[PDB]
Ligand binder design. Sequence first.
Ligand code: HEM
Ligand code: HEM
Ligand SMILES: C[C@H](O)[C@H](O)[C@H]1CNc2nc(N)[nH]c(=O)c2N1
Ligand SMILES: C[C@H](O)[C@H](O)[C@H]1CNc2nc(N)[nH]c(=O)c2N1
Ligand SMILES: CCSCCC(=N)NCCC[C@H](N)C(=O)O
Ligand SMILES: CCSCCC(=N)NCCC[C@H](N)C(=O)O
Ligand SMILES: [Zn+2]
Lengths: 411, 407
Amino acid sequence: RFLKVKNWETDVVLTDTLHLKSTLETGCTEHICMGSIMLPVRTKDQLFPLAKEFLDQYYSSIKRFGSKAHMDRLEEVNKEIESTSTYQLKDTELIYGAKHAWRNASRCVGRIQWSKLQVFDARDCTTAHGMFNYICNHVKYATNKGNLRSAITIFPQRTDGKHDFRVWNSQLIRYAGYKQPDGSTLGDPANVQFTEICIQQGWKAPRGRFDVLPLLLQANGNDPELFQIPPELVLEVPIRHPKFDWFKDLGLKWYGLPAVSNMLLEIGGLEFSACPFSGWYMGTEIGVRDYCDNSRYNILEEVAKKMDLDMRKTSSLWKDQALVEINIAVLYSFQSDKVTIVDHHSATESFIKHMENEYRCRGGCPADWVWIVPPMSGSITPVFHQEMLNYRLTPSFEYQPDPWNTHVWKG
Amino acid sequence: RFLKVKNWETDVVLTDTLHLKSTLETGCTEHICMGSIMLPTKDQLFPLAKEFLDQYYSSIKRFGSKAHMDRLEEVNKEIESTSTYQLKDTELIYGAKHAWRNASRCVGRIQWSKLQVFDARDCTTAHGMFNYICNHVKYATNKGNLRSAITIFPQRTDGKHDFRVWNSQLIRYAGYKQPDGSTLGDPANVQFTEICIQQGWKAPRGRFDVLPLLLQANGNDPELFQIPPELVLEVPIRHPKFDWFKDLGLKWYGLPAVSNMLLEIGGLEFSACPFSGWYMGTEIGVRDYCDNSRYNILEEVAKKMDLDMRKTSSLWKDQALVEINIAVLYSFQSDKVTIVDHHSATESFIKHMENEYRCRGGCPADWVWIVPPMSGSITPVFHQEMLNYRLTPSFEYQPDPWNTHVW
Ligand code: HEM
Ligand code: HEM
Ligand SMILES: C[C@H](O)[C@H](O)[C@H]1CNc2nc(N)[nH]c(=O)c2N1
Ligand SMILES: C[C@H](O)[C@H](O)[C@H]1CNc2nc(N)[nH]c(=O)c2N1
Ligand SMILES: CCSCCC(=N)NCCC[C@H](N)C(=O)O
Ligand SMILES: CCSCCC(=N)NCCC[C@H](N)C(=O)O
Ligand SMILES: [Zn+2]
């Protein structure tokens, strides 16, 4: 079967065959769409199909499908499964797997880059201190003094689910949040809960608006341990505006390296529960969401007050006006300090080109419109006008429950 | 079978039971989500009738009553005999209000119960249709203090006698390709304008020429009519700070009235059923003015503002988008024509969602259409999970009539 998607701005129609290779489910049925819902220990029996399917994909990509090398590797993996109940990926397969999980990430707008990914293989890691070292090297390599480079570090896979490696931070670098007795929040409200856990674990909190959180690291299913990223490794950008000289006095800065650390990488049926990855920011993530969500730094009032806009009626569009200026400041600041960042015009346009390329060469490009369309100026970016089809291919990045809810404390 | 939706800004979780009454199909499967796609007999009829009548009699707290049972039989007899049936005025008003209530793409549903229904089932000619429509246009406009309305023409019979309004909205501007190569006026309407011209219309060939109506009665060949110019309220577009803005020569119309959809009530099909409310500002200022495939004015506006257009990272498109949208809202307010901004409209829809959850067990909503095309995450609907499903009575898309009509 063939599915068609249309761009309502250009009338370009594309044809998706790739959806045929999807097995995993969406949350949707013929009777309900869940496209806007945020979040909608394996047997030998289930594992060999998953391994075979993966290695068949791998060997086709290298043009060696049905070669002796392909057949021997199936046999080698099959035997490994029956006798040890799992298997080890070759390095080539790990690299390919990681690249493809990115490629298959339907909520990621930056996929044009998927083939340039530095893979750090941390499968020899055994302790939290080892994890810490691996993570400092990643931050250093990825940051590259502002000229950011895509990277992923891969810690050992799940075995029995009692020995999991986990990074408890949701991002390697994030600012602390502190709930106050009077109900106000100091710093980033999104991270209050994790901050509390850190404090309980023994972190000494500076209690300021932008405190970089300590890493909380779990190796081999053991209780996690606290470590501080060396500050010289944490690149940050003070936020200022090209025409508004009062913008600096707002006190804003942000960090340059966004590194998601709480997701699970599935490759060939194997589960990598600690696999932090990073790229670079699109401006709106900071200027729209991190600064202007009511749930976050919530600076819209202060910015519009300093601009002296008419704030008595929503219909002046004061919020929209302050929003643009904040976003100009973020992009301005990052460019001034030579820290990689991309605007939402450039990023979405790159994505459309990537997407059409994927249709030609691969038969499709699964994409989640709810997530691909930026949180400001939606329809003046070309993605708003692009029909998309969302489906789940493996290898994949998945959500996983927060580790404080599941961890069996050893003491 | 019971579902949760979460607001990620406020942490409020809501329970949906209403989707279980869901009848029609979404386009999605467990394997593939089509959430962002724009367009994804006697035997058939009595179940549909029954389901609807059941829901009507429940709504007036008379379910299972003799008055309930008697209608069910009456309609059943009518279908068996005539192969169709007729709605009572009460059923028709309830049906129309509920099609609006169930419109998953409409952000303005807090207003759903305040709908003026104009029963035009006695209509027989295209001339009758024209009279009904001017009266709708004038009632709804109300000299700027807009009032929601629908006008309902006779239902489908054998399907060779359909009433249709060929226009996509009662009021739109014409579009003309030029030898020049470009497009004069509204590019969305080029094809429909050609149909008008070839059916007889003398085109003034300007930027903002109000299209004529092309009305089809009783499956007959459609006919042309001009809405009295004095019933088409328009607003010149000015900016409260930018004096030069008025020189762009921009205006828009006050009455948005979708006229190409199909109303389905209890299995009956009303193919001509124009309805109207009032504009949310972004519809004009973001989509109609700034879509590259529409009036596409971002470039000209940015020039006047003297922004650096050398690089996308200066957010010059974004800056000019805000101002264009400021000018729209201000221009409608100054002329006292009802309009709503995207902040106020989305705030209302969130309150409407809570009422619907508390009172009906849910509210079908298509997040993709509900979130405004500018400033998404600063409106509360951005953070609100929504379930999309299809309830009946409903407004449906239908094939453009020039593709079906045999002359
Ligand atoms: C090269 C620069 C990149 C850019 C500009 C980019 C862009 C983005 C953006 C804007 C988002 C949504 C962020 C949010 O709303 O929280 C996102 C999500 C995501 N990206 Fe990327 N990305 C890049 C690199 C990568 C890399 C290297 C990977 C993995 C190897 C990746 C995988 C993902 C995944 C799995 C998500 C969904 C995350 C979630 O659901 O929380 N991206 N991307
Ligand atoms: C009273 C003020 C109203 C407001 C503020 C409002 C708001 C909106 C908006 C912004 C849209 C999206 C339109 C687009 O992007 O083109 C929409 C769509 C829609 N509305 Fe409303 N609405 C109102 C009244 C009504 C009424 C009276 C009805 C029916 C009786 C209705 C039914 C619908 C339907 C069926 C759609 C989807 C139309 C389509 O798919 O093109 N609305 N509404
Ligand atoms: C409810 C809704 O799905 C939720 O707010 C989503 C919407 N789209 C998003 N898009 C991106 N890129 N990131 C997000 O966090 C969200 N949040
Ligand atoms: C392809 C995509 O679904 C399309 O651009 C949609 C997105 N959201 C929309 N939302 C509204 N209200 N109106 C629209 O026309 C659209 N277009
Ligand atoms: C790591 C996978 S995507 C590459 C980096 C990125 N562009 N975003 C990560 C999410 C950042 C989050 N939205 C924030 O605003 O901090
Ligand atoms: C009529 C039912 S919804 C209430 C009217 C409305 N607010 N919009 C209708 C769509 C108008 C179109 N988007 C435009 O910008 O011309
Ligand atoms: Zn869906």
